[PDB]
């Protein structure tokens, strides 16, 4: 019941000038083909991912990764999965209570001295390339009563997204299958109705702010994508394929927070990224106790929440 520092493991090779592979070969140890899971003696333990300490560790690691690699100096990179293992006396525990919301007790508490395959992908509004939900879709927050506390949604159907810049110098589009997104959004709407005493749910675009949180912001092929996501939160539902307008930016308020960046224009050629909408970042509109509705807008909180979504079961403890 303590918090310590850990090291990382990597399934990467140091022969190609990647910015994740060469970073992880020296910053991390190669994966150890030695997995030992121990389903504990049917013990029930209380977890709390919102006060987890490994998320800070991973945050430092991604900060160092970006700072060391990116310079205004152009090379293709990819998010290779990162493992996080721990020395002796300091051990990690895992929860496998099927549908866990990340803050209560767990019964089939496993035990492994290292994490699972986790790729450090940064994104806003929508969590990409994540791990699906096992049985249902999960609503996670310190408690939904507080509007300041963020809300994470674990989807049990990974939705496909396809962002593409063709060979019209910085424009791009991102195609999704509208029917699947509408279906899963209706399921999340039903579950929030359940969670809010059969309350009416409304989905709306963000009230305002910078482009990073206003739009779906991520990075693919080394180029920073911002996508206008008003179509997905079209509360009226549209049944066909949805094209999402997107643009590559060369000023970026750095994701850690240091000013506005400056980068070269994107490399010539086609830029394609097919990825997995796996989670949703939401903020509930505050106030309005008397009103019979609950309005939700996407995107919010730190980038730490992206890692905490994947770290919602593991917990470091003493031996």
């Amino acid at each position, epitope marked *: 019941d303590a918090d310590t520092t850990l090291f990382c493991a990597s399934d990467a090779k140091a022969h190609e000038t990647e910015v994740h592979n060469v970073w992880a070969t020296h910053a991390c140890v190669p994966t150890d083909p030695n997995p030992q899971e121990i389903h504990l003696e049917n013990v029930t333990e209380n977890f709390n991912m919102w006060k987890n300490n490994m998320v800070e560790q991973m945050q430092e690691d991604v900060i160092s990764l970006w700072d060391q690699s990116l310079q205004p100096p152009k090379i293709s990179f990819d998010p290779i999965p990162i493992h996080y293992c721990t020395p002796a006396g300091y051990v990690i525990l895992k929860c496998n209570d099927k549908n866990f919301n990340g803050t209560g007790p767990c019964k089939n508490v496993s035990s492994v001295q290292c994490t699972h395959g986790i790729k450090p992908v940064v994104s806003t509004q929508l969590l990409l390339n994540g791990s699906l939900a096992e049985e249902e879709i999960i609503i996670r927050s310190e408690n939904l009563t507080n509007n300041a506390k963020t809300i994470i949604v674990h989807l049990n159907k990974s939705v496909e997204i396809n962002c593409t810049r063709p060979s019209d110098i910085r424009k791009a589009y991102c195609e999704i299958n509208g029917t699947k997104w509408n279906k899963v959004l209706k399921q999340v709407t039903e579950k929030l109705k359940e969670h809010f005493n059969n309350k009416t749910i409304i989905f709306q675009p963000p009230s*305002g702010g910078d482009l990073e949180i206003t739009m779906h912001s991520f990075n693919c092929r080394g180029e920073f994508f911002y996508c206008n996501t008003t179509q997905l939160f079209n509360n009226t539902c549209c049944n066909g394929t949805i094209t999402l307008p997107c643009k590559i930016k060369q000023i970026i308020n750095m994701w850690q927070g240091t000013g506005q960046a400056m980068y070269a224009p994107p490399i010539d050629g086609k830029i394609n990224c097919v990825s997995n909408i796996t989670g949703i970042l939401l903020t509930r509109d505050g106030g*309005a106790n008397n009103t019979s509705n609950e309005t939700f807008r996407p995107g919010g909180g730190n980038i730490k929440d992206n890692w905490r979504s994947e770290l919602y079961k593991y917990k470091v403890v003493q031996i």
Partner: antibody
Amino acid sequence: HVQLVQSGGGVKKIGAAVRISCEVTGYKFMDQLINWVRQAPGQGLEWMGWMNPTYGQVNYSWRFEGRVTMTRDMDTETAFMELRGLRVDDTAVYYCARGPSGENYPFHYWGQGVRVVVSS
Amino acid sequence: LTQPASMSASPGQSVTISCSGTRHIISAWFQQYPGKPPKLIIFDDDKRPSGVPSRFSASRPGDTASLTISNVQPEDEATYICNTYEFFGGGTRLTVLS
């Protein structure tokens, strides 16, 4: 010690728009969301909204959407609130606030309040 | 949520302000003076920060939080506000009988 100062109030006519500032002193401005709250004369406190000073994520109440906006300035290390199309009932004392290091509520630290009077 | 508009107390007595509604969302209490911004005096229902005397206590055993003041003195003539999250009560204008 942390402290928040506000000095952008006064008297304005109907319609129009008002800009209200709040400057922080004693903590990392990037953290700790900033709340915009209002107290009417001889009435109770009414929370308009909050704003994140990182990239500017805001969250307004249902009674001010479209009317109120919130912005920030990092080197100034200050927050701005714009209220346009004011009404006479908008006559009130206006506060910026924030809570502990543990996120937002409750509001341990308040500003000083500025009087805003909507007149003819 | 719901607070009485005003109360009345002679010096040295004990009074109790009751904020119902709540919805079990914890409780915090502010004392506010004319012109001055609200000043938090009770947080986490039954806890008080430094500088708050022993006369002030509070308890939220349900959806009806309550703030008790013992041996009222001239500091206490102010407006007392219950709050849960972003929601505040209408204020109770406690007035000592001068």
